[PDB]
Amino acid sequence: MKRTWQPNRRKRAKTHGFRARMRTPGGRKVLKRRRQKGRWRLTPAVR
Amino acid sequence: AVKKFKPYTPSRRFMTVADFSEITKTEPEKSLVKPLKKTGGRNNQGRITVRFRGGGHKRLYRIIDFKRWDKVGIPAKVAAIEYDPNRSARIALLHYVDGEKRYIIAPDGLQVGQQVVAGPDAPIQVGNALPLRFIPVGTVVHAVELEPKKGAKLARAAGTSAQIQGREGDYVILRLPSGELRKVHGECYATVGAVGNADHKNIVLGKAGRSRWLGRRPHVRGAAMNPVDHPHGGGEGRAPRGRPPASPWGWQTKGLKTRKRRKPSSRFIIARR
RNA sequence: GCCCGGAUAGCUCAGUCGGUAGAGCAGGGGAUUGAAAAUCCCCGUGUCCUUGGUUCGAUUCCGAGUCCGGGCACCA
RNA sequence: UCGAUGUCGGCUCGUCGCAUCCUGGGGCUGAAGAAGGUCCCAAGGGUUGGGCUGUUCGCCCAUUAAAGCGGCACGCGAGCU
RNA sequence: CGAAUGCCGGCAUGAGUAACGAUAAAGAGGGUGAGAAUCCCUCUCGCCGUAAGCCCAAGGGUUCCUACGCAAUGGUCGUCAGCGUAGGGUUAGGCGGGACCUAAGGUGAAGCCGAAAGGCGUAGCCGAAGGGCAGCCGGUUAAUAUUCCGGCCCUUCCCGCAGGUGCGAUGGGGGGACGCUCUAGGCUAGGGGGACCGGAGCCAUGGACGAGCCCGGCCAGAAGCGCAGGGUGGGAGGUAGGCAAAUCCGCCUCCCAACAAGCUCUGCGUGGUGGGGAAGCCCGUACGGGUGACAACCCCCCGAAGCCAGGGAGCCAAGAAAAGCCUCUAAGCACAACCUGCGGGAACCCGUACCGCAAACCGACACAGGUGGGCGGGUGCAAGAGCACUCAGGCGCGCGGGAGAACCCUCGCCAAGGAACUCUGCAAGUUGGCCCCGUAACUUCGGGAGAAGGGGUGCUCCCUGGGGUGAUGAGCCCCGGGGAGCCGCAGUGAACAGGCUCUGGCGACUGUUUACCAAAAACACAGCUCUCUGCGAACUCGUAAGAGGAGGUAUAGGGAGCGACGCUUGCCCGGUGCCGGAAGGUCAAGGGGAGGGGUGCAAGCCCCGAACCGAAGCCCCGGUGAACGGCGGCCGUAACUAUAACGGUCCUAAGGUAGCGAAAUUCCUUGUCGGGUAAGUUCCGACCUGCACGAAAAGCGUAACGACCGGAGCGCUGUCUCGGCGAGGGACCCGGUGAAAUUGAACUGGCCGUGAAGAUGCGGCCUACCCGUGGCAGGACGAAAAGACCCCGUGGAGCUUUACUGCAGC
RNA sequence: CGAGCUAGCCCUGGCCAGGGUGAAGCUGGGGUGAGACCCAGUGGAGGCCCGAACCGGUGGGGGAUGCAAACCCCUCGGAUG
RNA sequence: GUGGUUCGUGGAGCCAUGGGGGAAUCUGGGCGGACCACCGCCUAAGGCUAAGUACUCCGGGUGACCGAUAGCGCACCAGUA
RNA sequence: GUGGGAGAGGGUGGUGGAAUUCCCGGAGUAGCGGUGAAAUGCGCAGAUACCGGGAGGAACGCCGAUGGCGAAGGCAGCCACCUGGUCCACCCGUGACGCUGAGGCGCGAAAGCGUGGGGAGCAAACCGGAUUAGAUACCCGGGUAGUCCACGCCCUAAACG
Ligand SMILES: NC[C@H]1O[C@H](O[C@H]2[C@H](O[C@@H]3O[C@H](CO)[C@@H](O)[C@H](N)[C@H]3O)[C@@H](O)[C@H](N)C[C@@H]2N)[C@H](N)[C@@H](O)[C@@H]1O
Ligand SMILES: NC[C@H]1O[C@H](O[C@H]2[C@H](O[C@@H]3O[C@H](CO)[C@@H](O)[C@H](N)[C@H]3O)[C@@H](O)[C@H](N)C[C@@H]2N)[C@H](N)[C@@H](O)[C@@H]1O
Ligand SMILES: NC[C@H]1O[C@H](O[C@H]2[C@H](O[C@@H]3O[C@H](CO)[C@@H](O)[C@H](N)[C@H]3O)[C@@H](O)[C@H](N)C[C@@H]2N)[C@H](N)[C@@H](O)[C@@H]1O
Ligand SMILES: [Mg+2]
Ligand SMILES: [Mg+2]
Ligand SMILES: [Mg+2]
Ligand SMILES: [Mg+2]
Ligand SMILES: [Mg+2]
Ligand SMILES: [Mg+2]
Ligand SMILES: [Mg+2]
Ligand SMILES: [Mg+2]
Ligand SMILES: [Mg+2]
Ligand SMILES: [Mg+2]
Ligand SMILES: [Mg+2]
Ligand SMILES: [Mg+2]
Ligand SMILES: [Mg+2]
Ligand SMILES: [Mg+2]
Ligand SMILES: [Mg+2]
Ligand SMILES: [Mg+2]
Ligand SMILES: [Mg+2]
Ligand SMILES: [Mg+2]
Ligand SMILES: [Mg+2]
Ligand SMILES: [Mg+2]
Ligand SMILES: [Mg+2]
Ligand SMILES: [Mg+2]
Ligand SMILES: [Mg+2]
Ligand SMILES: [Mg+2]
Ligand SMILES: [Mg+2]
Ligand SMILES: [Mg+2]
Ligand SMILES: [Mg+2]
Ligand SMILES: [Mg+2]
Ligand SMILES: [Mg+2]
Ligand SMILES: [Mg+2]
Ligand SMILES: [Mg+2]
Ligand SMILES: [Mg+2]
Ligand SMILES: [Mg+2]
Ligand SMILES: [Mg+2]
Ligand SMILES: [Mg+2]
Ligand SMILES: [Mg+2]
Ligand SMILES: [Mg+2]
Ligand SMILES: [Mg+2]
Ligand SMILES: [Mg+2]
Ligand SMILES: [Mg+2]
Ligand SMILES: [Mg+2]
Ligand SMILES: [Mg+2]
Ligand SMILES: [Mg+2]
Ligand SMILES: [Mg+2]
Ligand SMILES: [Mg+2]
Ligand SMILES: [Mg+2]
Ligand SMILES: [Mg+2]
Ligand SMILES: [Mg+2]
Ligand SMILES: [Mg+2]
Ligand SMILES: [Mg+2]
Ligand SMILES: [Mg+2]
Ligand SMILES: [Mg+2]
Ligand SMILES: [Mg+2]
Ligand SMILES: [Mg+2]
Ligand SMILES: [Mg+2]
Ligand SMILES: [Mg+2]
Ligand SMILES: [Mg+2]
Ligand SMILES: [Mg+2]
Ligand SMILES: [Mg+2]
Ligand SMILES: [Mg+2]
Ligand SMILES: [Mg+2]
Ligand SMILES: [Mg+2]
Ligand SMILES: [Mg+2]
Ligand SMILES: [Mg+2]
Ligand SMILES: [Mg+2]
Ligand SMILES: [Mg+2]
Ligand SMILES: [Mg+2]
Ligand SMILES: [Mg+2]
Ligand SMILES: [Mg+2]
Ligand SMILES: [Mg+2]
Ligand SMILES: [Mg+2]
Ligand SMILES: [Mg+2]
Ligand SMILES: [Mg+2]
Ligand SMILES: [Mg+2]
Ligand SMILES: [Mg+2]
Ligand SMILES: [Mg+2]
Ligand SMILES: [Mg+2]
Ligand SMILES: [Mg+2]
Ligand SMILES: [Mg+2]
Ligand SMILES: [Mg+2]
Ligand SMILES: [Mg+2]
Ligand SMILES: [Mg+2]
Ligand SMILES: [Mg+2]
Ligand SMILES: [Mg+2]
Ligand SMILES: [Mg+2]
Ligand SMILES: [Mg+2]
Ligand SMILES: [Mg+2]
Ligand SMILES: [Mg+2]
Ligand SMILES: [Mg+2]
Ligand SMILES: [Mg+2]
Ligand SMILES: [Mg+2]
Ligand SMILES: [Mg+2]
Ligand SMILES: [Mg+2]
Ligand SMILES: [Mg+2]
Ligand SMILES: [Mg+2]
Ligand SMILES: [Mg+2]
Ligand SMILES: [Mg+2]
Ligand SMILES: [Mg+2]
Ligand SMILES: [Mg+2]
Ligand SMILES: [Mg+2]
Ligand SMILES: [Mg+2]
Ligand SMILES: [Mg+2]
Ligand SMILES: [Mg+2]
Ligand SMILES: [Mg+2]
Ligand SMILES: [Mg+2]
Ligand SMILES: [Mg+2]
Ligand SMILES: [Mg+2]
Ligand SMILES: [Mg+2]
Ligand SMILES: [Mg+2]
Ligand SMILES: [Mg+2]
Ligand SMILES: [Mg+2]
Ligand SMILES: [Mg+2]
Ligand SMILES: [Mg+2]
Ligand SMILES: [Mg+2]
Ligand SMILES: [Mg+2]
Ligand SMILES: [Mg+2]
Ligand SMILES: [Mg+2]
Ligand SMILES: [Mg+2]
Ligand SMILES: [Mg+2]
Ligand SMILES: [Mg+2]
Ligand SMILES: [Mg+2]
Ligand SMILES: [Mg+2]
Ligand SMILES: [Mg+2]
Ligand SMILES: [Mg+2]
Ligand SMILES: [Mg+2]
Ligand SMILES: [Mg+2]
Ligand SMILES: [Mg+2]
Ligand SMILES: [Mg+2]
Ligand SMILES: [Mg+2]
Ligand SMILES: [Mg+2]
Ligand SMILES: [Mg+2]
Ligand SMILES: [Mg+2]
Ligand SMILES: [Mg+2]
Ligand SMILES: [Mg+2]
Ligand SMILES: [Mg+2]
Ligand SMILES: [Mg+2]
Ligand SMILES: [Mg+2]
Ligand SMILES: [Mg+2]
Ligand SMILES: [Mg+2]
Ligand SMILES: [Mg+2]
Ligand SMILES: [Mg+2]
Ligand SMILES: [Mg+2]
Ligand SMILES: [Mg+2]
Ligand SMILES: [Mg+2]
Ligand SMILES: [Mg+2]
Ligand SMILES: [Mg+2]
Ligand SMILES: [Mg+2]
Ligand SMILES: [Mg+2]
Ligand SMILES: [Mg+2]
Ligand SMILES: [Mg+2]
Ligand SMILES: [Mg+2]
Ligand SMILES: [Mg+2]
Ligand SMILES: [Mg+2]
Ligand SMILES: [Mg+2]
Ligand SMILES: [Mg+2]
Ligand SMILES: [Mg+2]
Ligand SMILES: [Mg+2]
Ligand SMILES: [Mg+2]
Ligand SMILES: [Mg+2]
Ligand SMILES: [Mg+2]
Ligand SMILES: [Mg+2]
Ligand SMILES: [Mg+2]
Ligand SMILES: [Mg+2]
Ligand SMILES: [Mg+2]
Ligand SMILES: [Mg+2]
Ligand SMILES: [Mg+2]
Ligand SMILES: [Mg+2]
Ligand SMILES: [Mg+2]
Ligand SMILES: [Mg+2]
Ligand SMILES: [Mg+2]
Ligand SMILES: [Mg+2]
Ligand SMILES: [Mg+2]
Ligand SMILES: [Mg+2]
Ligand SMILES: [Mg+2]
Ligand SMILES: [Mg+2]
Ligand SMILES: [Mg+2]
Ligand SMILES: [Mg+2]
Ligand SMILES: [Mg+2]
Ligand SMILES: [Mg+2]
Ligand SMILES: [Mg+2]
Ligand SMILES: [Mg+2]
Ligand SMILES: [Mg+2]
Ligand SMILES: [Mg+2]
Ligand SMILES: [Mg+2]
Ligand SMILES: [Mg+2]
Ligand SMILES: [Mg+2]
Ligand SMILES: [Mg+2]
Ligand SMILES: [Mg+2]
Ligand SMILES: [Mg+2]
Ligand SMILES: [Mg+2]
Ligand SMILES: [Mg+2]
Ligand SMILES: [Mg+2]
Ligand SMILES: [Mg+2]
Ligand SMILES: [Mg+2]
Ligand SMILES: [Mg+2]
């Protein structure tokens, strides 16, 4: 039956992408946190 | 005048459609249409601000002329009578003699082939717009400006009309379709006649779907909801209002007057609805 | 089974600061009528449900009891 | 027994008690006979099919030798409903 | 540390147990190899075939091809692999996207708003499965191909030559440019048939050397031409409108053509050329290659939902934009520029492997689930994408071998009976397609209707009516009509394919809903009523700006109730709400200051403060019921009796009107009576004593409708009396792989007792060799889940209100 | 941080085999003073009918450490809105 | 009208200020806890100003600090799988 | 046929004044209304009575008659349009073309009904005040359908001469 994850690449990038994060003071602080933790990816992969 | 249907289905027996006999032209004046964005009753936040709206047939907007006075004295011929989906009324196509085309909302009895014109001039006759002060007392009239230069506001709806009860000072006394008695300014244009398509109030939608076509989605009673939702929500099986009947936002809905008391336009009103 | 009300003239009901209790209708005697209603003039009258008790004195306050009006009997 | 002892009835499957419904054996009889009444012995076996209702129960139809009453966590849901 | 349903890890029990993932299905020969049911090859068998085949798009990301491998992954095996290692593989001016356009939305010079962060917003800009734009056929690789090659065609940019012309834009105008249903004519895709053309070969087993059987009989193609079709008037004059200008467009007038006539555009056909090309046999190919062959390459018929395409008709709910394109003029330039033809040159970036209804995507799995678009052959069955079989193609579902117990599942059949089963005909059966005959109550006249109930249905011959295409004819194809016979148990012979009636409740209806225990009588619904709202509307969201409402205007919009239709919808305004009320009472800040007080020598500075003036609110006056709501009781009375039309009285704001009534409502209750049944707590009809109906939380009806819920009957049945037999997949045995919850430890009997009151574990008796396997569920107060009922906690949370207190709002 | 599930709306596309019923209109005929209206033929309407795809999820059975954390089978509702 | 302070409206001054009214330049102004007198203190409505102070990504020294279930989540290619 | 007449004969569209009611302005004060008599009701929140302005509906005084017209039901301010019936005169035309009339068709007061409008006055129902033994009546105060318009129904009557 139809499940919760229905991949689409435009969505993924349009939504969790770098430019998106940067757009919003909330998301700029996501990058800040992930960078401080030293995440390898700051941002989901997509493609 | 209101086509009926034999009951060859249920709901085809109560359905009633407008009679389109008056309609001359079957596709609009391309220079005169523009697209109109459908809201869904949603504001510039994506938020519904008017409930139960949406779906329903796509429409092109007819840009219509509610200022008649920037054409003063230039006559025009009534080219066709057309169906405007954006209103109860019907719209008359005007060919002006200097070759501009306009839509006017179409008065009762106005027929194709007619000369029509606006100004302090001009005969008192159906289709002709004038500042109110020159329209003789007693004349029924429509498409009335509320303040000068600001466009037709009052009596635009199919069958509606206003009537001139008297002059006082700079202002004239109109009775509105509502029956309110209103001072309006003398220089406000009004075009003479009623709106016509008066038959309009008797159409009988006839089924649920036909309401949907006009873009009105179903409407659920407060009675049918739960207390989270509405003053009338809840309460084991059915039940009465159990309080003064309210809106979902909890203000009272039988009789409570919502006109702001201290409005300035108060000085200009004489009566009720 | 548990809580509430009520009992006052023949009927329907009022009232009581614990001291001499009333309204209507009925009823009795007279008038009026040919006669009968309607009308008029006189007329009363109950031991205030029972039984204890308080008090100088209880329809009135107390505690029990009848019998009628009523409400309840929910979670299982 | 609340860090769970599933709770009415039906069904299936039994098993026991006797304060015996029938069949067996008796006494008394207001027991002529036949048919009963009542009490005594007796638990081996038996103890129907339907209409109504979730019903247990109970009432009704049609039969019967009779259509017995109780217990078994109101017997039985790791057996079904 | 021994306990915390503790934490982390290790290893046990259950147990060689359940299971090994669709019941489409296998068998043998050969091969390879240490090893083979499981890999390759052949033959045979089976399954899919509107797919289980083929091609796009997403998403996945080397899974692709090849060699070498088998430790682990693979539910077994494994020499195989979507696995390990390694090497190779994706080629474009024309396909997709970008260097083009705009949609919703986004963003956003201007601008507005907001403590900050930020919110809005015109122009513009971004944004696509929409608009715009130039490639078709075939060949080639182990692996890419509209990409490489071959053939035949084309686009844009730059430069030039020729001819043409007032050239010229982000400005103007035209166009692009649109719905839904139905549909004409001509075509193509696709298909069937041919005695015609071409082809290896075949004659079995009784027959056939045959006008036999088997196979194939095309594809693409510029210009021209031809057939069908879309678009489309020409000229003059006037001109104040299209935010400058316009010779364009609009508007008025006059003159010509009404028509594809012309012009133009597109489909199809034909076309220089190019290509393809079966069966069968051989070659060994893993997989293809040789030949068939100088292959033929034509006639007929059916024929789209596709094309001509902006076709036509009807209807109401009235059906994007912008660029490309054409036209017009403006600066400016006219040696420019542009237009047409020709010719050379120039033509970038990204994608292209493979999977793709799935073992490669979403579902932790090589998961019986989910996933958009196109193609989807044949024959038969009325049709069809249905059904059965089948082609191309693809599969036999990654554990097998056996046995032929119980029991389970899925399936077949059954004497007599036929609902007796049961909460209930739950389940199963019956019915079943098409043609003809026939069809009631009632009804809103449409329906009810497939009412119900019947007859027909195959094949053979003979005769015969109408149509399409052809020619008006043959042939092909479509629809029938009449007659005479033949066969079986049976002719919609297999598959797909309503059981029917009567009568109540509720809801008018089609719809909608608790994803995952409720599909309903609930929601919605057209429709009816009340109410607000005069437009910068009321209302809603937002601190605001803004926005929705609505580019709408009272025939409109919001809110509430009721809920098609029919006939109707009574009385009460005391209380509450809303509405009206320029009086009166009360009323806060403020005004006002009679009077009083602090201090100083004083002038003074400072504080308190009566009258009186003073909003909305409340009080007060009234109105209002499709506003919140409410709509009694007692006693007497008629010439049998009984009852009580009548009278009396208490109380109230007034005491339930019509209709209906033991009801989706009736406690007593299985009310009483009638109906139905042999028998009826249900059901239908009455009655009225309505615990505790009653008129828009609508009253009473209503045709039609319903996977709603009652009650009856016919039909038919394994529901049942009451079971039996049979089939397959399990269960059982053998070989391979091998879990699970649970588990203080266990050397774990019965009775009668006792015990914290239900004992394998204590007492006394009884019974009892050790250990398994297939079975059944009575017990281990079996497992599971720290009871969801109940209480408790000065625990929580949702909801309400004339609870308290605030806040938004007004 | 989430509307890649789910709910509503906005923009832009696509899809719905085959059969059946036969509204208006139209045209003819009849009728009339004219009409209403009646009959035929044509026409092809509809939250119309049967039934695939597609969307559902009605009843029963199975499953219940599943094939599956909602599935399978039989049956059933809608199918131009 | 509020905030700050120990000050929660208190006898409530002080410092700050959203609203209203609204001065003077030394004989001017603020303050010493309502107010007044006296006596003092101080000079608002512009600005800058090291050090002594806080911290530890980083480097170094030292531990009656851990010793791979400890010590940082990470002694190991960990903010990784 | 010609030439004339009379009339509230019908359909349509316009249009006038009186009055009632409401609203606004003015002025003015204690009662108005009502009846058998009263009360309810209205009125110091300024009623009644008076003047001026406005709004809206319905009906048309005098003329007016015991009169006229219509087949009946019916028809009454004024104006115009459209249109029926009818009488007279002249003796011109047709040449028995006539009378009636089952069925049919059409009209048909009031009330009532549907959908819209409209609503001043009146007014079933209803409320209230009186009267009465009662009073679901007569009288008074309110008052909703209705009365009016359009369109479609109903088809009745002491539709009577
Ligand atoms: N109703 C449940 C059970 O009843 C009977 O047995 C019970 C029995 O009932 C009686 O049985 C008799 C024998 O048939 C009858 O004749 C009696 N009328 C009856 O009361 C009881 O005396 C027992 N204590 C219990 C037993 N289960 C049945 N035999 C069973 O099949 C049935 O399942
Ligand atoms: N018991 C004898 C009769 O009594 C009543 O009638 C009286 C009536 O009762 C009234 O009933 C009303 C309802 O019906 C109530 O609402 C009145 N409040 C009440 O007073 C009295 O108001 C009359 N004065 C006398 C009348 N005979 C009954 N109506 C009758 O059925 C009964 O038969
Ligand atoms: N059939 C034709 C005509 O017959 C009559 O006219 C007559 C007309 O009547 C006049 O009609 C008028 C309309 O009603 C009245 O206003 C006059 N008062 C009256 O005298 C006579 O004056 C003529 N002499 C003869 C005419 N036949 C009808 N009345 C008219 O309607 C009709 O048009
Ligand atoms: Mg997941
Ligand atoms: Mg995408
Ligand atoms: Mg920043
Ligand atoms: Mg890295
Ligand atoms: Mg926006
Ligand atoms: Mg937003
Ligand atoms: Mg209508
Ligand atoms: Mg609505
Ligand atoms: Mg609703
Ligand atoms: Mg609810
Ligand atoms: Mg909410
Ligand atoms: Mg609420
Ligand atoms: Mg409520
Ligand atoms: Mg209720
Ligand atoms: Mg409710
Ligand atoms: Mg409000
Ligand atoms: Mg009393
Ligand atoms: Mg005494
Ligand atoms: Mg005498
Ligand atoms: Mg005493
Ligand atoms: Mg005493
Ligand atoms: Mg409970
Ligand atoms: Mg409770
Ligand atoms: Mg317990
Ligand atoms: Mg347990
Ligand atoms: Mg005995
Ligand atoms: Mg015996
Ligand atoms: Mg004897
Ligand atoms: Mg004897
Ligand atoms: Mg025995
Ligand atoms: Mg039963
Ligand atoms: Mg019991
Ligand atoms: Mg019983
Ligand atoms: Mg018990
Ligand atoms: Mg039990
Ligand atoms: Mg049990
Ligand atoms: Mg169970
Ligand atoms: Mg049970
Ligand atoms: Mg157990
Ligand atoms: Mg311990
Ligand atoms: Mg431990
Ligand atoms: Mg083990
Ligand atoms: Mg075991
Ligand atoms: Mg086993
Ligand atoms: Mg097994
Ligand atoms: Mg398998
Ligand atoms: Mg198998
Ligand atoms: Mg070998
Ligand atoms: Mg070998
Ligand atoms: Mg083999
Ligand atoms: Mg097959
Ligand atoms: Mg096929
Ligand atoms: Mg993946
Ligand atoms: Mg790999
Ligand atoms: Mg391996
Ligand atoms: Mg293996
Ligand atoms: Mg596996
Ligand atoms: Mg590999
Ligand atoms: Mg190329
Ligand atoms: Mg491109
Ligand atoms: Mg470039
Ligand atoms: Mg763009
Ligand atoms: Mg923004
Ligand atoms: Mg900003
Ligand atoms: Mg695109
Ligand atoms: Mg392209
Ligand atoms: Mg080409
Ligand atoms: Mg390939
Ligand atoms: Mg030019
Ligand atoms: Mg064919
Ligand atoms: Mg062919
Ligand atoms: Mg040949
Ligand atoms: Mg032979
Ligand atoms: Mg031969
Ligand atoms: Mg063969
Ligand atoms: Mg011009
Ligand atoms: Mg210009
Ligand atoms: Mg077109
Ligand atoms: Mg067209
Ligand atoms: Mg110039
Ligand atoms: Mg490729
Ligand atoms: Mg593929
Ligand atoms: Mg699938
Ligand atoms: Mg597909
Ligand atoms: Mg695959
Ligand atoms: Mg598999
Ligand atoms: Mg799968
Ligand atoms: Mg998977
Ligand atoms: Mg699908
Ligand atoms: Mg068929
Ligand atoms: Mg097809
Ligand atoms: Mg099929
Ligand atoms: Mg057989
Ligand atoms: Mg049988
Ligand atoms: Mg039978
Ligand atoms: Mg039943
Ligand atoms: Mg069934
Ligand atoms: Mg019948
Ligand atoms: Mg019919
Ligand atoms: Mg039939
Ligand atoms: Mg029927
Ligand atoms: Mg029927
Ligand atoms: Mg037959
Ligand atoms: Mg045959
Ligand atoms: Mg069949
Ligand atoms: Mg089928
Ligand atoms: Mg069948
Ligand atoms: Mg059928
Ligand atoms: Mg019932
Ligand atoms: Mg329904
Ligand atoms: Mg559910
Ligand atoms: Mg749920
Ligand atoms: Mg349903
Ligand atoms: Mg619902
Ligand atoms: Mg209704
Ligand atoms: Mg605003
Ligand atoms: Mg706005
Ligand atoms: Mg707006
Ligand atoms: Mg708008
Ligand atoms: Mg509304
Ligand atoms: Mg409702
Ligand atoms: Mg009511
Ligand atoms: Mg009230
Ligand atoms: Mg009130
Ligand atoms: Mg009141
Ligand atoms: Mg006052
Ligand atoms: Mg006040
Ligand atoms: Mg009051
Ligand atoms: Mg008597
Ligand atoms: Mg009642
Ligand atoms: Mg009853
Ligand atoms: Mg009954
Ligand atoms: Mg009841
Ligand atoms: Mg009962
Ligand atoms: Mg039954
Ligand atoms: Mg029942
Ligand atoms: Mg009944
Ligand atoms: Mg009710
Ligand atoms: Mg109500
Ligand atoms: Mg209802
Ligand atoms: Mg009913
Ligand atoms: Mg009816
Ligand atoms: Mg019904
Ligand atoms: Mg339905
Ligand atoms: Mg249903
Ligand atoms: Mg029942
Ligand atoms: Mg039955
Ligand atoms: Mg069986
Ligand atoms: Mg078997
Ligand atoms: Mg024991
Ligand atoms: Mg021991
Ligand atoms: Mg011991
Ligand atoms: Mg065992
Ligand atoms: Mg057991
Ligand atoms: Mg607990
Ligand atoms: Mg407490
Ligand atoms: Mg608490
Ligand atoms: Mg609580
Ligand atoms: Mg969504
Ligand atoms: Mg149709
Ligand atoms: Mg139909
Ligand atoms: Mg349908
Ligand atoms: Mg398809
Ligand atoms: Mg199901
Ligand atoms: Mg369900
Ligand atoms: Mg199930
Ligand atoms: Mg089970
Ligand atoms: Mg269907
Ligand atoms: Mg403070
Ligand atoms: Mg305090
Ligand atoms: Mg302070
Ligand atoms: Mg101070
Ligand atoms: Mg300040
Ligand atoms: Mg000073
Ligand atoms: Mg200071
Ligand atoms: Mg100081
Ligand atoms: Mg001091
Ligand atoms: Mg100081
Ligand atoms: Mg410092
Ligand atoms: Mg370690
Ligand atoms: Mg560690
Ligand atoms: Mg170690
Ligand atoms: Mg370790
Ligand atoms: Mg660690
Ligand atoms: Mg006249
Ligand atoms: Mg007169
Ligand atoms: Mg003569
Ligand atoms: Mg003659
Ligand atoms: Mg009439
Ligand atoms: Mg009338
Ligand atoms: Mg009156
Ligand atoms: Mg009265
Ligand atoms: Mg009288
Ligand atoms: Mg009225
Ligand atoms: Mg008369």
PDB file of N, CA, C and O (backbone and C1' of nucleotides) and ligand atoms in Angstrom, chain E residues 60-61 360-362, ligand 56:
ATOM      1  P     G E  60      16.079   8.615  -5.837  1.00  0.00           P
ATOM      2  O5'   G E  60      16.549   7.205  -6.346  1.00  0.00           O
ATOM      3  C5'   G E  60      16.457   6.108  -5.475  1.00  0.00           C
ATOM      4  C4'   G E  60      16.910   4.849  -6.153  1.00  0.00           C
ATOM      5  C3'   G E  60      18.380   4.688  -6.427  1.00  0.00           C
ATOM      6  O3'   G E  60      19.130   4.454  -5.270  1.00  0.00           O
ATOM      7  C1'   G E  60      17.156   3.854  -8.232  1.00  0.00           C
ATOM      8  P     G E  61      20.533   5.200  -5.122  1.00  0.00           P
ATOM      9  O5'   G E  61      21.282   4.713  -6.424  1.00  0.00           O
ATOM     10  C5'   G E  61      21.701   3.360  -6.538  1.00  0.00           C
ATOM     11  C4'   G E  61      22.508   3.146  -7.787  1.00  0.00           C
ATOM     12  C3'   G E  61      23.894   3.762  -7.781  1.00  0.00           C
ATOM     13  O3'   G E  61      24.702   2.963  -8.589  1.00  0.00           O
ATOM     14  C1'   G E  61      22.640   4.667  -9.562  1.00  0.00           C
ATOM     15  P     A E 360      12.815  -5.337  -7.812  1.00  0.00           P
ATOM     16  O5'   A E 360      14.273  -4.789  -8.061  1.00  0.00           O
ATOM     17  C5'   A E 360      15.049  -4.436  -6.947  1.00  0.00           C
ATOM     18  C4'   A E 360      16.044  -3.395  -7.308  1.00  0.00           C
ATOM     19  C3'   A E 360      15.457  -2.115  -7.866  1.00  0.00           C
ATOM     20  O3'   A E 360      16.171  -1.030  -7.292  1.00  0.00           O
ATOM     21  C1'   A E 360      17.068  -2.974  -9.351  1.00  0.00           C
ATOM     22  P     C E 361      15.775  -0.552  -5.813  1.00  0.00           P
ATOM     23  O5'   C E 361      14.629   0.502  -6.123  1.00  0.00           O
ATOM     24  C5'   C E 361      14.865   1.621  -6.960  1.00  0.00           C
ATOM     25  C4'   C E 361      13.638   2.488  -7.026  1.00  0.00           C
ATOM     26  C3'   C E 361      12.864   2.577  -5.728  1.00  0.00           C
ATOM     27  O3'   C E 361      13.393   3.529  -4.835  1.00  0.00           O
ATOM     28  C1'   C E 361      11.373   2.092  -7.486  1.00  0.00           C
ATOM     29  P     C E 362      13.505   3.137  -3.297  1.00  0.00           P
ATOM     30  O5'   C E 362      12.016   3.336  -2.769  1.00  0.00           O
ATOM     31  C5'   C E 362      11.348   4.586  -2.795  1.00  0.00           C
ATOM     32  C4'   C E 362      10.048   4.496  -2.032  1.00  0.00           C
ATOM     33  C3'   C E 362      10.062   3.607  -0.811  1.00  0.00           C
ATOM     34  O3'   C E 362      10.588   4.254   0.319  1.00  0.00           O
ATOM     35  C1'   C E 362       8.143   3.142  -2.077  1.00  0.00           C
TER      36        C E 362
HETATM   37 MG    MG I  56      18.019   1.756  -3.605  1.00  0.00          MG
END
